[PDB]
Structure formats: structure tokens, C-alpha cells
């Protein structure tokens, strides 16, 4: 009464144009109602007749109806199983080379459903050469079509390094960036930013996205009302920012990031801090710009607000470290940290339950802050010296014993470096000396690491300008290691070594 399936299957399996043509229309109509659709599926003979004729037909009207049938079947989880087993995936991929627009939509949407809720559909699309076809079709201009196409690429690229490389080889990066700076349809931009996000953790795709103009193209959508689009852009930008220290025209992006620091959302702030840290690292220009738009003030605020969330402070402290040295306004930034009540919270971050990455970052910042004479006293009063010395004592004793992320040598250099700058102040020199550090500093002259030698000879040089300290350095037998260091290939090491041997007369 309601199931005349075997009759229609035989009619689709005919060596005639108009017979196959007319039957495909009537089958397409049965899939439109959510009751007779269950009859088309669960019948393997019927679904195979469709897959065959769709891949074989030469009429325009027939290719649309057959493809729409599978599209209608793919909405139900038991339809996807029929299309997969019927061998529809290899046919639909060949159908991506179709000249007519309307059919492509049906083909791509069906493959999209298969990729989402059918086991093994990802593999089968890859092997049928679906990737190359999907990338090459990124030059189309229908926004709904492109949204499904980019999502297909995201599903196929996610957690699959081989696919990311093929997308790269087929000029994927450039095409996806182009979408970001042209189209403004939210759903397309979202799925497109999700593809780029997946691609951005690939070490070969990453530079390609950067070189195509990805950083800026992603920066365009950060003030956009859509939150899921903004977040995905941020995530991608973070992955990319370590390979972006050369890119120019960054002013707009840098300004927007400083503003995004004031956001209520942790994910937004975390990313903003991270991207800034990476872009301010060793790039002279970005350091200047970020300071000009109130980067210090926003970052201190960020750290103060963040508390003990190390995901926020670690990149924010790193950015602060970058901004407090080696640019025209570095002194200004050093003062600004103090003037925005940042010094106490900075010193606090040297104490537990802080982990090693944050401590390394915090130490390097204090080193920079201590370059400004007006920071000498407050850093002393907050207790930076005794804590730095404790990190130094413990890290050194870990080097002798024959842990997480960073090596203790980096901590040894960091603290001694920090103390070398602090020892510029006479009152700091007293505190440093009173903590029995002279013995440790002398032993540090024996270090194979030249950077440790330099900061060790540096702090000792600073301390040796006082008579009482000079005697202690001599008493610890520093003469022998210092005279060795007079001949170092490192001029800094040799200069300080001379200055200490000078003062011990």
C-alpha cells in the first residue's frame, strides 16, 4: 500500500534515458516526506541503483534529483550507513568535478554529513582524492556552499598531519586567508578560521599562513560581535605568532589585542597575552607600539586580575619582560610598572604555588625592572632579593646532584643576572652580602656556561666596589678563577673579571 520499492529499482536499472530520468524524479519526491524516506533506505538494491545512475547520468535534471535523494537520506543516521556501504563516497568525489553549480551543493552537503556522523567516512573521502577537489573548489563564491566546503576540510584536517600537508600542497593556506579578508558571512568565517586553526599547529602550514597574510586577515575580525569567530581567530593567531616576528602593518592588531586584555573572558585574555608576548619578542617596532597604546597599564591590570591563574600571568609577564628592555621607551615602561602598582604582585609571583615557567619569566622581568634606579628600593622592600637568592641556592644545588619543563641552569643565570642589576644600589649590596652569596657567586665562575660566568663576574664586580665585600671575595679564593676568566673569548666575562681583580688591591 505504501511500499512499491522493487518496481522503482528496476526502472532506475534500465538502458534508456527518459525511463531512468523520470524514475529518479519520483524517488526524489519520496525522500521529501519523513516516512517514505525509511523505505528508500534499508533497501540495498534501491540505494545502489541511485549511486550508480548518479555517477553515470548525463542529464542535468537527473543528476540533481538523485543527489538530492542521498542528501535527504543523509539526515538520518541509518541513511549514512546505506550510502557508505553502497559505495557512494567515491562517486560523490567524482561528482565534485561537476560543471553545474546546483549539483555540487548536494554532493558536498552529503559528504559533509558522512564526515560528521559516519564511521570510516573520513578515510574513504581521503583515498578517493576528495581533499584536492575540495581545496580546488575554494574559488567558488556561494557563501553557504563555501561554509560546508571549509567545514569538510576542518573535519578532514583535524588530527591528521598527512591531510594538512596535502591541503598545503594544493595551495590551501592562500585560499583560506583570501576568504578571511573578503567575505563577511559569519558562518563561513567561523568554519574558515577553524580550518586555519587546525592548520596553524603544522610547522610547514604555519609559515605559509603567515606569508599569505594570515595574521592581519585574522586581525580584521577581532572586534566582530560573533564570539566563537573571535575566539577561534585568537587561538589561531596564538599558534601563528611565534613565526610572525617579521610581519609588518601590525599596528591595528596590536591595538586591538591591548584592548582585548580588558575582557571578562579568560580565553580571550589568555590568548591576547600570548599573542602579545610572541609579537613583542625581539621585535623592536612592536615593543614601541604596544607601549604607546597603554600596553603596560593593561598588562599590569591583567596580572593583578589573574591572581594565580598561571595560564594568564606567564604570557603576560613574558610580554612585560619584552616591553621593559631594548627600545626607545623601555625606561618609561619600567617606571610605568611601578606607577600602576605592579611591583608587589610581580615579586609575589616568585613564591609558591608558582611553577617554573612563570618563575623564569618573572625573574627576567625583575632583572629588567631593576634597570630603573627608582625600582631599586621598592623591589628591595617587597623582598625580591632574599627570594631570588633562595631560587639561586636551590637551582645551583640541583645542578650538582648526579625538573619540570625548564632547566635549573636557566634559573641560575636568571637570578644572578637579576641580582647583578639590583647590586647597583648600595643598600641592595648590603642585603645581598648579608645572605652569604659571595661563596656561591665564586663557585659560579667555574661554570662551563659563559652567560653564567658573565653575570657571576658582574655581581661580584658590583659588590667589590665596597671594601668589606672585596675581602670576602678574596677570602673565598676568587683570584684563581678570575685570572682564568681574564682570557675568556667572551669580552663581557673578561671585562668584569678584570674589574674584580682591580678592586682586590
Amino acid at each position: 500500500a505504501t511500499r512499491a520499492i522493487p518496481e522503482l529499482t528496476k526502472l532506475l536499472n534500465d538502458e534508456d534515458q527518459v525511463v531512468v530520468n523520470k524514475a529518479a524524479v519520483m524517488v526524489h519526491q519520496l525522500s521529501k516526506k519523513e516516512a517514505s524516506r525509511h523505505a528508500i533506505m534499508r533497501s540495498p538494491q534501491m540505494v545502489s541503483a541511485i549511486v550508480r545512475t548518479m555517477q553515470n547520468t548525463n542529464d542535468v535534471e537527473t543528476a540533481r534529483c538523485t543527489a538530492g535523494t542521498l542528501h535527504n537520506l543523509s539526515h538520518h543516521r541509518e541513511g549514512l550507513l546505506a550510502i557508505f556501504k553502497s559505495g557512494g563516497i567515491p562517486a560523490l568525489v567524482k561528482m565534485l568535478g561537476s560543471p553545474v553549480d546546483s549539483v555540487l551543493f548536494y554532493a558536498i552537503t552529503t559528504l559533509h554529513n558522512l564526515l560528521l556522523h559516519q564511521e570510516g567516512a573520513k578515510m574513504a573521502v581521503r583515498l578517493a582524492g576528495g581533499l584536492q577537489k575540495m581545496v580546488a573548489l575554494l574559488n567558488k563564491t556561494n557563501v553557504k556552499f563555501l561554509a560546508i566546503t571549509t567545514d569538510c576540510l576542518q573535519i578532514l584536517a583535524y588530527g591528521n598531519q598527512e591531510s594538512k600537508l596535502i591541503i598545503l600542497a594544493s595551495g590551501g593556506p592562500q585560499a583560506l586567508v583570501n576568504i578571511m579578508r573578503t567575505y563577511t558571512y559569519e558562518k563561513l568565517l567561523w568554519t574558515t578560521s577553524r580550518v586555519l586553526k587546525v592548520l596553524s599547529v603544522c610547522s610547514s602550514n604555519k609559515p605559509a599562513i603567515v606569508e599569505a597574510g594570515g595574521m592581519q586577515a585574522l586581525g580584521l575580525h577581532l572586534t566582530d560581535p560573533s564570539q566563537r569567530l573571535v575566539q577561534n581567530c585568537l587561538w589561531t593567531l596564538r599558534n601563528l605568532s611565534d613565526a610572525a616576528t617579521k610581519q609588518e602593518g601590525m599596528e591595528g592588531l596590536l591595538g586591538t589585542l591591548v584592548q582585548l586584555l580588558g575582557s571578562d573572558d579568560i580565553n580571550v585574555v589568555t590568548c591576547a597575552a600570548g599573542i602579545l608576548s610572541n609579537l613583542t619578542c625581539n621585535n623592536y617596532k612592536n615593543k614601541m607600539m604596544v607601549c604607546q597604546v597603554g600596553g603596560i597599564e593593561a598588562l599590569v591590570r591583567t596580572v593583578l586580575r589573574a591572581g594565580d591563574r598561571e595560564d594568564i600571568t606567564e604570557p603576560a609577564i613574558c610580554a612585560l619582560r619584552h616591553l621593559t628592555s631594548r627600545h626607545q621607551e623601555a625606561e618609561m615602561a619600567q617606571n610605568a610598572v611601578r606607577l600602576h602598582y605592579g611591583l608587589p604582585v610581580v615579586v609575589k609571583l616568585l613564591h609558591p604555588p608558582s611553577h617554573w615557567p612563570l618563575i623564569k619569566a618573572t625573574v627576567g622581568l625583575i632583572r629588567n625592572l631593576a634597570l630603573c634606579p627608582a625600582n631599586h628600593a621598592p623591589l628591595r622592600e617587597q623582598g625580591a632579593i632574599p627570594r631570588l637568592v633562595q631560587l639561586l641556592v636551590r637551582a645551583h644545588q640541583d645542578t650538582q646532584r648526579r625538573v619540570e619543563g625548564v632547566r635549573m641552569e636557566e634559573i641560575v643565570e636568571g637570578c644572578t643576572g637579576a641580582l647583578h642589576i639590583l647590586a647597583r644600589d648600595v643598600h641592595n649590596r648590603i642585603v645581598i652580602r648579608g645572605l652569604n652569596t659571595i661563596p656561591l657567586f665564586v663557585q659560579l665562575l667555574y661554570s662551563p656556561i659563559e652567560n653564567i660566568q658573565r653575570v657571576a663576574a658582574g655581581v661580584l664586580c658590583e659588590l667589590a666596589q665596597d671594601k668589606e665585600a672585596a675581602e670576602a671575595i678574596e677570602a673565598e679564593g676568587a683570584t684563581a678563577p678570575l685570572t682564568e676568566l681574564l682570557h675568556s673569548r667572551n669580552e663581557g666575562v673578561a671585562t668584569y673579571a678584570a674589574a674584580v681583580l682591580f678592586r682586590m688591591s
Binding site: 500500500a1 505504501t2 512499491a4 518496481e7 526502472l11 534500465d14 534508456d16 525511463v19 517514505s36
Partner: peptide
């Protein structure tokens, strides 16, 4: 196209319209 093929065509087109009366 042939004598018998055109008979096959029209008898196949009639079957489509016969099932259309069955459902609706």
C-alpha cells in the same frame, strides 16, 4: 528508439503514474 524499445518506454512511464495513484 526501436519498435520494441518504444513499447518498453511507454509501459515503463505508465508504471510510474500507476504508483502515483497508489500513494496520493
Amino acid at each position: 528508439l526501436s519498435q520494441e524499445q518504444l513499447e518498453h518506454r511507454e509501459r515503463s512511464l505508465q508504471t510510474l503514474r500507476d504508483i502515483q495513484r497508489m500513494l496520493a
